[PDB]
Design an enzyme around this catalytic site. Structure first.
Site, PDB file in Angstrom:
ATOM      1  N   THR H   1      48.273  39.794  34.189  1.00 20.67           N
ATOM      2  CA  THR H   1      48.412  38.781  35.275  1.00 20.67           C
ATOM      3  C   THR H   1      47.725  39.300  36.536  1.00 20.67           C
ATOM      4  O   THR H   1      48.038  40.392  37.013  1.00 20.67           O
ATOM      5  CB  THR H   1      49.923  38.410  35.595  1.00 20.67           C
ATOM      6  OG1 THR H   1      50.736  38.501  34.415  1.00 20.67           O
ATOM      7  CG2 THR H   1      50.052  36.985  36.194  1.00 20.67           C
ATOM      8  N   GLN H   2      46.768  38.507  37.024  1.00 25.06           N
ATOM      9  CA  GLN H   2      46.057  38.673  38.305  1.00 25.06           C
ATOM     10  C   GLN H   2      44.868  37.702  38.333  1.00 25.06           C
ATOM     11  O   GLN H   2      44.506  37.126  37.300  1.00 25.06           O
ATOM     12  CB  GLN H   2      45.632  40.134  38.591  1.00 25.06           C
ATOM     13  CG  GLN H   2      44.355  40.669  37.941  1.00 25.06           C
ATOM     14  CD  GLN H   2      43.901  41.972  38.606  1.00 25.06           C
ATOM     15  OE1 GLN H   2      44.451  43.035  38.325  1.00 25.06           O
ATOM     16  NE2 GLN H   2      42.908  41.891  39.505  1.00 25.06           N
TER      17      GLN H   2
END
Ligand code: 3OE
Ligand code: MG
Ligand code: MG
Ligand code: MG
Ligand code: MG
Lengths: 212, 237, 235, 242, 241, 222, 233, 233
Positions: H1-2
């Site tokens: 996640t990013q």
């Protein structure tokens, strides 16, 4: 996948198909769905190929360890409960297996345990597991009798897989056959559904849904 | 280690110093824009490969370290110095100032004199380089003690080296160039060898000068090394 | 924790040695109750009698201990024992059977005997309790972690003397009032003081609860001891 | 008394040396390696006539192709066998083959090293070395029949023959003479049986001594009491005629 | 926190702490086990020093591990409690996973393993306890008796004894126990067990306690009135020439 | 969201002869509709006479191959330079794959060599470690295109003896290395014609008792 | 001076000495002799193997670390196993992460640092093994000597073990000749086998005595034992 | 996640007869805001290697520091740091590719596409690609992002297979790059006029050009374009 195992007068019959699929793609027709854990112990495979193969091979290792530790063959009950309890540790993580652990020991007699990835473990006389289970069940239940001969029981096993290999799209290839007795397991051959179907139709007069 | 004697001394540290005294002699000389390090390498046998057992170590890009005593201990201290320098640069972006670096080593060495489960380091380390505001030379004892130096020496030949180092500070009160101090380092090492004459030796010099090396640590090699050796050989007689 | 060439545990034997100097504590078990009496270690007029308990401690509603040894060590063990009883109550909705609580404590003591290189607790206990399986029970435990059951027992100073006197006059059909009398007599005879006065005593009973069917723990107030010291004839 | 892994001025580990003494106190074990198998034999040594002799396990199976005999503080050998068995079975699980005898021995000797606390490098979960030596014998495809001697020092040697325990000095020089590269299995069975009879305090029978072998064909087998008896008969008759 | 090694090798090759743990067993009250044709009997002595005890509540020496296996011991009483508890846990766990009670060998091998582990772990001292473990394997009539010691060694015995003066009773048992003619009944097996204690106990009142185990989880303790009848008959029968 | 997986195309094919084995694969590496390279090998010699391909997501493919080659190295170190037999390699790879059963290597992996008796051998694995020995197996993008051809032209399936009324089968005879290579080249030209991810080049690795041999053929580049 | 000062690796003597480390050094001198030497193209290890009995096998003294690196041991053998394992890993890490063959010098630095931590930790002990490390890297042939003190020096040749002083004087004498044995493996091996001879109060060195290892320009590190060393006796 | 924030666009590259060329524009975009106008996305490492990075600029600045930390570390106790034990292009690549793969596997990628370009010690051209998934491939031409779609087809008209490489001069290859950069400027909305270009030649060494611009742009034809179909004026 269709797999069965039943108990009768003269031991245990174990029969399985040999088809492997990925979606509608037929990946293999020559897959080995029985693991020979030892001269007195068989395991059947339904569900995820890897899951079964990997964990039932491991089971065999765990059973070998029991024999070295205790100087006696592992009981069917115990071998089944090992695989059962392992599977239970992984509950909800996605393991996918339907399994029968079959064998004879002095103390137990011939014995079948059903073990799945939900953690369920059942002792019983007749089991069919896999996508074609109901088809196998239809023939098996209607012709089963405790008193069946060794020759007849082997056929009923062989015939039941064929039934399922015919109707279920995800079963097929070949029937692999096993007999388990007082003295242990004996292979009863690979039987290609290609030849077997026509032979059985001819000799038995069944399968009239089939043109030609 | 963590034991004070009745008169307030630490015998274990004092004994660690004896291990230093026992070692090869090494020196550092501060010049008007850089620093010079030199060390004596005892040639135990003709089987040792010349130029290939490097004693002087670099930390980051701008710091040189030399040490006398238990060589492995020195390596342990330099590894730590490198971690401590990487850590500093990671957070503050600028490469570690020399006083900042000195204290990092200082606290680490001192820590090894607090607990009964450890021994003090068996080395004295001479080190320094060029930072944002000049050249810096340090010497760090097994006790964790360190101060700045104009010149520094440790090991077997420390007394004669200090005598020569004291003489230079008196003749050149206004500075002393990097090119000069490299020569002088060769001389002082040669003079200090008098004590260990039973065996042959090899000279290692390194420097970090603002104008001569661009504030980066560099080994003295080739023509500059030979010229310094000559000066030392010619001024020994 | 180590063994001696004799097969003895040095630190345990020395802990037991420490205990023999602590004030004597006495437990006597009768058919209708239990008596706990203990002697306070030679004190002072300025010690607050009213708000002091150095030898007798309540564990739950039905179980109590008499202490002999390091008080601070005992308070550690008592506190955990108090917790163990409440855990049992929470788990089973039944008050902990006396032996289970004794065994637990005894095991914590055995622990320091076998690993961790910590000094054992310098404590000996007399447990007085009731439950609906064994009725009135009396137990002893010491720094080794061994525990045994008794009809009468003593710990601390002069146990040798106190035990012989109890063996002499104890009889299985005693009432509590007779057991009270024995306990005080025995202390008086084994004291290392001029007289056994109220200000040097802690006294408790576990009776069949006046008139009910329930079990009651009476920890004697300073004045009540002075009363029972006259009744029995020692003034 | 100071530490467990301290060096003597000579350059030897104190605690390792004394464990070797503990082994000399133990029962005699003998192993002989031929080209028709390896024989492992031990002295049961019942400490009383009320001890049921066949509960004395001093020869144990590791895998079908590996067995071992022990000598010394034999309780210390329990977890060594657990580790050995696991290593063999595990190896088969990962590789669908037999663990090499040499590899199994090395694994057992790594376990033997783990005395200390961590020893600035890894971790050590044991306070003292093991007080027991092992004779590890078996077959594999590469090097055929093999006999190793696993010591609590962490070293292991391969031997054509080897004796460990209280009789080991006199038994070894005895093996020095009798061993040749042409020995049959039947000859080797007899030699172990003979050499045990020499060094044992009691009179050797099928109760205070035990025999076993490993062959490529039948695996590791512990000979039972009826069978050893017949080989004792045969030893007496062979030597009474000499 | 504390893992400093206490059990180490001596120059002459012994582990000193283990050897002293045996000294603690030597001084512990005597225990004896003998096996009949269809039973195993376990006897233990009780000391004379203190006699104002409560026998209803004092932990007796013979302990049930499972419903078919019992454990008696000699040595430090407190140490024994730790072994018995662990053994009880292991018994329930074996039933859970293998779906069958433990054999008497298994339970012995387990207890001996715990014992051994305490001879080679940092910061722990070995158990000052030796054990007799007796019972019948599930669905088996063939009687079992095993003995463990602080070292971790174990083995089976037609009959055995441990504790103080065990030398005397072992000497007695070696003379009076016939392997081809083992005690044919419970009654005649109990009698031999009492006779062996009488060499050491010197009294025998409530000083001797006897537990009898039979096939298929039949384990009974004997009362004072039942032991008295054995003691009385023994000295009376054996007196004349 | 971040997707840890991708798909680099490619097709691989492994056929077992009598005393030989081939493992072939196209040399094109793709992302969506772009070509990354026209020659990026994905069949590797792993030592000990084993060849390997892990086709699908190239990052997971390389990571697996790298890790198995390493397993071979450490097998030598730990087992006195023993040759890792094909079957033992197969089992080893199963554990590497299953090791990541809950975050799989997204590869259909194939290995090829000679078995203990010197026969040709092919093993094929699913992403999580399920494996079987096979006479031949194609994997990857154009697998669905090539496999039925091989069922027909290698195992002679549905082919009967002319005129036996479809009862006597074409006898399953053994193929020469020239006859196998032909079938490979033809399988890949057919695959290149009908699959957008197959093309550029063909690299074949042949394994005999003499070692690992390499062969290369240009493919259509469209 | 020697009394209360050799209890652990964490105590200095009043002379500045670490006795546990000096005692670990004494385990080397007790060990069987081994020799290492190099030219520009190759580096050679020659070791005399020792058997504990006439029925036993001669115990191995040469361990392979990578295709370009290997060592010979003298001292406590299990320690050599620990140190070569770590060295195999460092080589492995360098290949996998950087796709680079580990420089022989860095291998030296790495063994030194590992040995050092055991000369300063309480409850640990120093390593009791000496090592001779040979390799071919991006700067040619290399030979190293490792002492359990942590001191690692790069030499043209050396020997360590029992009576090793003989071979070391020989090599110090033969220096100028063997350094130039380039492009000839069998002559360099001959110069090493002849070097290990100067260290024999023992006897003739047989085909089981003897253990030779070679690495160089186009030769991966290989071990020769038994039959394969016959041609050098 | 990013998710990437400040970004850089294509990095484009090819091999020629003697070395490699790599270019990337000097822009850092913040979504559709052309936020930063002097960003250098070519990273010289040593002087046989240039690393070109596109994607998230913060992660780029992280890799920059990693690469500098790698030069420092390689110099440590290494007398051959500027000679035979200098960092090779392949060493730098394998390291990055390891990092990239570990990060994706930890579900926390460095949001980048990286092309490592350089010349090996033996003279060989090195050109390889790695991205946020750990995917790696090598080709005569390599480009990231839009560059993949528009630069590659034009660069492949020059070097189409391996055999085209010795036939391609420094001048021809540079011209093809320079022209590809113009095309990208025409059609990539996240691109800039200003770009850096680096040449790594086995004879010339490292030539690094800053402050280049797209020249010779066609715009005159726009004047005749009216409406979107029917409009005439
Ligand atoms: C029991 C047995 C033993 C040997 S063959 C067999 C019969 N099973 C079968 O034929 C089953 C039927 C489908 C299935 C049912 C239930 C669970 C999973 C799959 N097939 C299989 O198990 C087949 N495998 C697969 O179908 C398969 C598919 C995807 C996959 O992981 C890909 C992935 C996805 C997302 C992220 C990362 C990676 C792994 C295996 C295998 C034979 O190739
Ligand atoms: Mg079907
Ligand atoms: Mg000084
Ligand atoms: Mg194999
Ligand atoms: Mg195509």
């Amino acid at each position: 996948t269709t797999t069965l195992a039943f108990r009768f007068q003269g031991g245990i019959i174990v029969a399985v198909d040999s088809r492997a699929t990925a979606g509608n793609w037929v990946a293999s027709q020559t897959v080995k769905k029985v693991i020979e854990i030892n001269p007195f112990l068989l395991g059947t495979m339904a569900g995820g190929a890897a899951d079964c193969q990997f964990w039932e091979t491991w089971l065999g290792s765990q059973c070998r360890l029991h024999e070295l530790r205790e100087k006696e063959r592992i009981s069917v009950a115990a071998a089944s409960k090992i695989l059962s309890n392992l599977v239970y540790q992984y509950k909800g993580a996605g393991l996918s297996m339907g399994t029968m652990i079959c064998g004879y020991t002095r103390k137990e007699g011939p014995t079948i345990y059903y073990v799945d990835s939900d953690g369920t473990r059942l002792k019983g006389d007749i089991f069919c597991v896999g996508s074609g289970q109901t088809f196998a069940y239809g023939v098996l239940d209607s012709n089963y009798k405790w008193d069946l001969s060794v020759e007849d029981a082997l056929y009923l096993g062989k015939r039941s897989i064929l039934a399922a290999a015919h109707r279920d799209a995800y079963s097929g290839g070949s029937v692999n056959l096993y007999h388990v007795t007082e003295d242990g397991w004996i292979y009863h051959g690979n039987h290609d559904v290609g030849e077997l179907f026509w032979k059985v139709k001819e000799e038995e007069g069944s399968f009239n849904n089939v043109i030609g | 280690n963590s034991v004070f004697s009745p008169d307030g001394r630490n015998f274990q540290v004092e004994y660690a110093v004896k291990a230093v005294e026992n070692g090869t002699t090494s020196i550092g000389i501060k010049c008007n824009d850089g620093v010079v390090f030199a060390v004596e390498k005892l040639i135990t046998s003709k089987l040792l490969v010349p130029q290939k057992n490097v004693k002087i170590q670099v930390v980051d890009r701008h710091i040189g370290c030399v040490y006398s005593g238990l060589i492995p201990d020195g390596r342990h201290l330099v590894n730590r110095g490198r971690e401590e320098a990487a850590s500093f640069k990671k957070l503050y972006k600028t490469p570690i100032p020399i006083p900042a670096f000195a204290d990092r080593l200082g606290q680490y060495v001192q820590a090894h004199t607090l607990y009964n489960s450890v021994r003090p380091f068996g080395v004295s380390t001479i080190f320094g380089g060029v930072d944002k505001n000049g050249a810096h030379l340090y010497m760090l004892e097994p006790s964790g003690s360190y101060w700045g130096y104009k010149g520094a020496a440790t090991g077997k030949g420390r007394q004669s080296a200090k005598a020569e180092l004291e003489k230079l500070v008196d003749h050149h009160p206004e500075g002393l160039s990097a090119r000069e101090a490299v020569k002088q380092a060769a001389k002082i090492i040669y003079l200090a060898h008098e004590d260990n004459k039973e065996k042959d030796f090899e000279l290692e010099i390194s420097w970090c000068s603002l104008s001569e090396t661009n504030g980066l640590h560099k080994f003295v090699k080739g023509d500059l090394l030979q010229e310094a050796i000559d000066f030392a050989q010619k001024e020994i007689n | 924790t180590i063994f001696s060439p004799e097969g003895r545990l040095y630190q345990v034997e020395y802990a037991l040695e420490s205990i023999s100097h602590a004030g004597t504590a006495i437990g006597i078990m009768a058919s209708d109750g239990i008596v706990l009496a203990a002697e306070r270690k030679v004190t002072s007029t300025l010690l607050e009698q009213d708000t002091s308990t150095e030898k007798l401690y309540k564990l739950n509603d039905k179980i109590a201990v008499a202490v002999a040894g390091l008080t601070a060590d005992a308070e550690i063990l008592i506190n955990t024992a108090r917790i163990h009883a409440q855990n049992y109550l929470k788990t089973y909705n039944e008050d902990i059977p006396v032996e289970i609580l004794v065994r637990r404590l005894s095991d914590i003591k055995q622990g320091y005997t076998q690993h961790g290189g910590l000094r054992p607790f310098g404590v000996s206990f007399i447990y007085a309790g009731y439950d609906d399986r064994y009725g009135y029970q009396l137990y002893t435990s010491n720094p080794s972690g061994n525990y045994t059951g008794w009809k009468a027992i003593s710990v601390g100073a002069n146990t040798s003397a106190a035990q012989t006197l109890l063996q002499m006059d104890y009889k299985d059909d005693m009432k509590v009032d007779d057991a009270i009398e024995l306990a005080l007599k025995t202390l008086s005879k084994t004291t290392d003081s001029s007289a056994l006065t109220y200000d040097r005593l802690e006294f408790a009973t576990i009776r069949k609860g006046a008139n009910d069917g329930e079990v009651y723990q009476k920890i004697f107030k300073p004045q009540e001891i002075k009363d029972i010291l006259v009744k029995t004839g020692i003034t | 008394d100071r530490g467990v892994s301290t060096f003597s001025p000579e350059g030897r580990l104190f605690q390792v040396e004394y464990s070797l003494e503990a082994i000399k106190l133990g029962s005699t074990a003998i192993g002989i390696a031929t080209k028709e198998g390896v024989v492992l034999g031990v002295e049961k040594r019942a400490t009383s006539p009320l001890l049921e002799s066949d509960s004395i396990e001093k020869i144990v199976e590791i895998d079908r192709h590996i067995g071992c005999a022990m000598s010394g503080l034999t309780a210390d050998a329990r977890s060594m066998i657990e580790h050995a068995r696991t290593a063999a079975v595990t190896h088969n699980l990962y590789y669908d083959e037999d663990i090499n005898v040499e590899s199994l021995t090395q694994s057992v000797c790594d376990l033997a090293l783990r005395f200390g606390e961590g020893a600035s490098g890894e971790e050590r979960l044991m306070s003292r070395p093991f007080g027991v030596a092992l004779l590890i014998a078996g077959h594999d495809a590469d090097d055929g029949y093999q006999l190793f001697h696993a010591e609590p020092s962490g070293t292991f040697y391969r031997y054509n023959a080897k004796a460990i325990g209280s009789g080991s000095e006199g038994a070894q020089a005895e093996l020095l003479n009798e061993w040749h590269s042409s020995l049959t299995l039947k000859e080797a069975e007899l030699l172990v049986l003979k050499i045990l009879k020499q060094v044992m305090e009691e009179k050797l029978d099928e109760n205070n001594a035990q025999l076993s072998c490993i062959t490529k064909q039948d695996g590791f087998k512990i000979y039972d009491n009826e069978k050893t008896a017949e080989l004792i008969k045969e030893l007496k008759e062979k030597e009474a005629a000499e | 926190g504390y893992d400093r090694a206490l059990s180490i090798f001596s120059p002459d090759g012994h582990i000193f702490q283990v050897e002293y743990a045996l000294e603690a067993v030597k001084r512990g009250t005597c225990a004896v086990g003998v096996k009949g044709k269809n039973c195993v009997v376990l006897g233990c002595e009780r000391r004379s020093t203190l006699k104002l005890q409560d026998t209803r509540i004092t932990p007796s020496k013979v302990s049930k591990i499972d419903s078919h296996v019992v454990l008696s011991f000699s040595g430090l009483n407190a140490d024994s409690r730790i072994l018995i508890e662990k053994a009880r846990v292991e018994a329930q766990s074996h039933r859970l996973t293998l779906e069958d009670p433990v054999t008497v060998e298994y339970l012995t091998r387990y207890v001996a393993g715990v014992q051994q582990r305490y001879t080679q772990s940092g910061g722990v001292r070995p158990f000052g306890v030796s054990t007799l473990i007796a019972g019948f394997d599930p669905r088996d009539d063939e009687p079992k008796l095993y003995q463990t010691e602080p070292s971790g060694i174990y083995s089976s015995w037609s009959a055995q004894t441990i504790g103080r003066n065990s030398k005397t009773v072992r000497e007695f048992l070696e003379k009076n126990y016939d392997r081809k003619e083992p005690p044919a009944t419970v009654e005649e097996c109990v009698k031999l067990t009492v006779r062996s204690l009488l060499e050491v106990v010197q009294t025998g009142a409530k000083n001797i306690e006897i537990t009898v185990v039979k096939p298929d989880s039949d384990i009974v303790a004997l009362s004072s009135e039942e032991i008295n009848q054995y003691v009385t008959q023994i000295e009376q029968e054996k007196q004349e020439q | 969201q971040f997707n840890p997986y991708g798909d680099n195309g490619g097709t691989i094919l492994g056929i077992a002869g009598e005393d030989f084995a081939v493992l072939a694969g196209d040399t094109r590496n793709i992302t969506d509709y772009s070509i990354n390279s026209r020659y990026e090998p994905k069949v590797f010699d792993c030592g000990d006479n084993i060849v390997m391909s892990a086709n699908g997501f190239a990052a997971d493919g390389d990571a697996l191959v790298k890790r198995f080659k390493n397993s071979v190295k450490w097998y030598h170190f730990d087992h006195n330079d023993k040759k890792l037999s094909i079957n033992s390699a197969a089992r080893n790879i199963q554990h590497l794959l299953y090791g990541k059963r809950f975050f799989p290597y997204y590869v259909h992996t194939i290995i090829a060599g000679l078995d203990e008796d010197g026969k040709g051998a092919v093993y094929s694995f699913d992403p999580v470690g399920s494996y079987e020995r096979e006479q031949c197996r194609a994997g990857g993008a154009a697998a669905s295109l090539i496999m039925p051809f091989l069922d027909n032209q290698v195992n002679f399936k549905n082919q009967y003896e002319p005129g036996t009324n479809g009862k006597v089968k074409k006898p399953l005879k053994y193929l020469s290395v020239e006859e196998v290579i032909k079938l490979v080249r033809d399988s890949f030209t057919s695959a290149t014609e009908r699959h957008i991810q197959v093309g550029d080049g063909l690299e074949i690795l042949i394994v005999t008792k003499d070692g690992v041999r390499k062969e290369f053929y240009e493919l259509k580049r469209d | 001076f020697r009394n209360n000062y050799d209890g652990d690796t964490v105590t200095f003597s009043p002379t500045g000495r670490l006795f546990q480390v000096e005692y670990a050094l004494e385990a080397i001198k007790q060990g069987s002799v081994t020799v290492g030497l190099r030219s520009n193209t190759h580096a050679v290890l020659v070791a005399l193997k020792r058997n504990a009995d006439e029925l036993s096998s001669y115990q191995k003294k040469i361990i392979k670390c990578d295709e370009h690196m290997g060592l010979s041991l003298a001292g406590l053998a299990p320690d050599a196993r620990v140190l070569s394992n770590y060295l195999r890993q460092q080589c492995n890490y360098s290949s996998l992460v950087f796709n680079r063959k580990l420089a022989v010098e860095r291998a030296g630095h790495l063994l030194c640092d590992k040995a050092q931590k055991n000369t300063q930790s309480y409850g640990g002990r120093p390593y009791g093994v000496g090592l001779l490390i040979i390799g071919y890297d991006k700067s040619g042939a290399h030979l190293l000597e490792f002492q359990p003190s942590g001191n690692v020096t790069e030499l043209y040749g050396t020997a360590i073990g029992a009576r090793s002083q003989g071979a070391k004087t020989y090599l110090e004498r033969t220096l100028d000749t063997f350094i130039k044995i380039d492009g000839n493996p069998d002559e360099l091996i001959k110069a090493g086998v002849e070097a290990i001879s100067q260290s024999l109060r023992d006897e003739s060195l047989t085909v089981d005595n003897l253990s030779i290892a070679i690495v160089g320009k186009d030769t991966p590190f290989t071990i020769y034992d038994g039959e394969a060393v016959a041609k050098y006796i | 996640t990013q998710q990437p924030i400040v970004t850089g666009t294509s990095v484009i590259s090819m091999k020629y007869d003697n070395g490699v060329i790599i270019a990337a524009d000097n822009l850092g975009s913040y979504g559709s805001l052309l936020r930063f106008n002097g960003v250098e996305r070519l990273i010289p490492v040593g002087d046989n290697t240039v690393v070109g990075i596109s994607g998230d600029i913060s992660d780029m600045q992280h890799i920059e520091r990693l690469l500098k930390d790698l030069v420092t570390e390689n110099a440590y106790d290494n007398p051959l740091a500027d000679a035979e034990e200098a960092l090779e292009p392949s060493y730098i690549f394998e390291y990055l590719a390891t990092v990239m793969y570990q990060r994706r596997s930890k579900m926390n990628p460095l949001w980048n596409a990286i092309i490592v370009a350089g010349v090996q010690s033996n003279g060989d051209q090195f050109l390889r690609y790695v991205n946020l998934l750990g995917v790696t491939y090598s080709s005569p031409t390599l480009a990231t992002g839009f560059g993949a779609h528009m630069a590659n087809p034009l660069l492949r008209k020059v070097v189409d297979r391996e055999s085209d490489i010795p036939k391609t001069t420094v001048q021809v290859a540079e011209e093809a790059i320079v022209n590809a950069m113009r095309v990208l400027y025409y059609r990539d909305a996240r691109s800039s006029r200003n770009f850096s270009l680096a040449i790594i030649d086995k004879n010339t060494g490292l030539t690094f050009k800053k402050n280049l611009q797209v020249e010779n742009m066609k715009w005159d034809f726009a004047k005749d374009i009216k409406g979107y179909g029917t409009q005439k004026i």
